[PDB]
Design an enzyme around this catalytic site. Structure first.
Site, PDB file in Angstrom:
ATOM      1  N   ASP A  50       1.260   9.075   2.815  1.00 37.51           N
ATOM      2  CA  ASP A  50      -0.168   9.306   2.904  1.00 37.51           C
ATOM      3  C   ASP A  50      -0.333   9.916   4.299  1.00 37.51           C
ATOM      4  O   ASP A  50      -0.464   9.211   5.297  1.00 37.51           O
ATOM      5  CB  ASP A  50      -0.906   7.965   2.751  1.00 37.51           C
ATOM      6  N   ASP A  72       0.703   4.843  -2.360  1.00 40.21           N
ATOM      7  CA  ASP A  72       1.392   6.122  -2.233  1.00 40.21           C
ATOM      8  C   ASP A  72       2.732   6.140  -1.511  1.00 40.21           C
ATOM      9  O   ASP A  72       3.069   5.223  -0.765  1.00 40.21           O
ATOM     10  CB  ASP A  72       0.450   7.124  -1.560  1.00 40.21           C
ATOM     11  N   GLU A 108       0.880  -1.148   0.000  1.00 40.86           N
ATOM     12  CA  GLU A 108       0.000   0.000   0.000  1.00 40.86           C
ATOM     13  C   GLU A 108       0.933   1.218   0.000  1.00 40.86           C
ATOM     14  O   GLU A 108       1.568   1.469  -1.014  1.00 40.86           O
ATOM     15  CB  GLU A 108      -0.957   0.001   1.201  1.00 40.86           C
TER      16      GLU A 108
END
Length: 542
Positions: free
Chosen positions: A283, A280, A247
């Site tokens: 974040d 990303d 993630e």
């Protein structure tokens, strides 16, 4: 001798002398050496009796699930711990041998293999990232939850140094003043690799990730939930490197988790690098009506006073967004984002200042509408755009100092200005002319409205050029112009109205406007006398 020995030697117990970790823990006084692999069961809990211990690991903790360490005294240190799952799960590897990202669901499903590293276990976020993968993934590759996690629970002042592992996770639950130092590249599992969760009790404080690196993992490398470093900014990430997070590299949670807030305030995010995250780089948003936090009536959505100290971050290769955040009244500096598939920066900020930002070759796969987006009324001072590959959409922001080969039609800001430049020189290379163009975006975002040019007369080395002042007419740039020295004639070429000039064509008093009178082959002059009155005179005749 016993008396003497007891006073002259360093105390340390070693796991090889005990059947269980708790037995070793109970006998420990100063040091505790993990000298043999230890298979733990999920939920196995060790009570260290409030002792300040130095745990030296020279072997592995093997198991799926959590090994829970509790009641370690303030000042305790764990070094060299290595977590490894017993299960070898099915992992996907969304990149090629040339390190190109695979975006096709079928191509990603084809990478499936059983391994404890070099890939990660698919999660629901992957269903969004690679559309259609949910239906293509075989049932044995879906919903896996393998992680060998070291959970430090409700401790204060405990540091974990040089930790590593395979399908490893490190969870600080309800901890304060704890640090994850020099992580020795653990390869992540299903859960966050390093998590500071403080949903219960006081807001987390003094929690840091200092130095080191992590690789892989299904979700974010570092995750913070309900931490507040206070005005002293006591907590955060400094000098860290995240590689290939499933993630994001670093994530501060947003919204409500359970019945309380998972948001974070007053943390530092500095001198860190995030490379190749599937989502990303950073974040740092807080919003996605805020139980346990500021009400929406006090601070509107995306406008919380997060107050993080953010400086000197580098992001490269994100399949998602390079740098993202929200908040109001923020100061952000020295951010460099390169080669990202989605936006380099996605900023839902208001009344914030961004200084020395470099967004180089992002949104390369058109995942978003722009390379950099800013929603609120912000200030950008120093913005470098374009590498070798809208560019900026910050409707309410004022910007200054853009550098780079940007296409001006792809810029949208509230105000752009260079108020403090000195004497200027425009240097032209490779062309027969130099130019200073003007573009009024309200008139046209694609065409220049006027220009000041200098063009070569003859060829190189002629020592002659002509200066030209232009204006757009009929959507044709440079349609009308005044020239000085065209063909080295040393005179000014002046444009006149092609027909009878109307009274309203002349603007100022004490000015004249030449116009053509075809019927007499004469040049006339509409004159606005110094007293404001108009008079038409004959200027040139046969």
């Amino acid at each position: 001798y016993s008396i003497e020995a007891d006073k002259k030697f360093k105390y340390s117990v070693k796991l090889s002398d005990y059947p269980t970790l708790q037995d070793a823990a109970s006998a420990a006084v100063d040091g505790l050496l993990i000298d043999r692999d230890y298979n733990f069961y999920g939920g196995e809990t060790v009570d260290f009796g409030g002792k300040v211990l130095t745990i030296e690991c020279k072997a592995k903790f093997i198991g799926d699930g959590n090994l829970i360490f509790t009641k370690l005294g303030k000042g305790s240190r764990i070094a060299g711990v290595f977590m490894e799952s017993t299960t070898t799960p099915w992992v996907i590897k969304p990149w090629t041998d040339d390190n190109q990202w695979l975006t096709d669901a079928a191509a990603v499903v084809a990478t499936l293999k059983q391994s404890k590293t070099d890939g990660y276990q698919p999660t629901v976020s992957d269903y969004v990232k690679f559309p259609g993968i949910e239906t293509l993934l075989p049932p044995n590759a879906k919903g896996q939850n393998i992680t060998s996690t070291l959970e430090i629970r409700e401790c204060i002042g405990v540091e974990v140094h040089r930790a590593s592992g395979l399908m490893a996770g490190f969870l600080f639950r309800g901890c304060h003043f704890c640090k994850m130092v020099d992580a020795n590249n653990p390869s992540g599992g299903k859960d966050g690799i390093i998590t500071f969760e403080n949903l219960s009790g006081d807001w987390g404080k003094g929690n840091y990730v200092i130095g080191g690196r992590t690789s892989y993992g299904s979700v974010s490398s570092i995750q913070f939930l309900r931490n507040n470093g206070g005005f002293e900014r006591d907590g955060g990430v400094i000098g860290f490197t995240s590689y290939r997070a499933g993630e994001s590299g670093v994530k501060t949670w947003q919204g409500t988790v359970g019945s309380t807030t998972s948001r974070n305030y007053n943390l530092q995010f500095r001198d860190s690098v995030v490379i190749y995250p599937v989502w990303d780089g950073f974040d740092l948003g807080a919003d996605t009506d805020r139980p346990g936090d500021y009400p929406i009536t006090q601070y509107p959505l995306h406008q919380l006073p997060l107050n993080h100290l953010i400086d000197n971050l580098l992001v490269r290769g994100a399949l998602g967004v390079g740098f993202g955040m929200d908040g109001k009244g923020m100061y952000v500096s020295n951010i460099t984002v390169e080669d990202c598939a989605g936006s380099g920066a996605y900023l839902l900020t208001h009344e914030s200042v961004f200084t020395n930002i470099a967004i180089i070759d992002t949104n390369t796969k058109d995942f978003q509408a722009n390379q950099i987006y800013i929603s609120g009324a912000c200030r950008v001072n120093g913005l470098r755009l374009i590498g070798i590959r809208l560019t900026i959409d910050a409707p309410n922001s004022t910007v200054s100092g853009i550098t780079g080969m940007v296409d001006p039609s792809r810029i949208n800001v509230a105000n752009l200005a260079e108020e403090g430049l000195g004497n200027i020189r425009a240097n032209s290379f490779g062309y027969d002319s130099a130019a200073i163009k003007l573009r009024i975006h309200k008139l046209s975002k694609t065409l220049d409205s006027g220009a000041l040019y200098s063009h070569i007369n003859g060829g190189a080395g002629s020592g002659s050029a002509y200066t030209q002042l232009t204006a757009i007419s009929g959507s044709t740039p440079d349609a009308v112009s005044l020239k000085v020295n065209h063909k080295d004639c040393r005179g000014a070429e002046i444009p006149f109205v092609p027909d009878i000039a109307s009274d309203d064509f002349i603007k100022d008093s004490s000015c004249f406007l030449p116009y053509w009178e075809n019927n007499s082959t004469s040049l006339k002059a509409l004159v606005k006398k110094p007293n404001g009155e108009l008079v038409r005179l004959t200027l040139a005749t046969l």
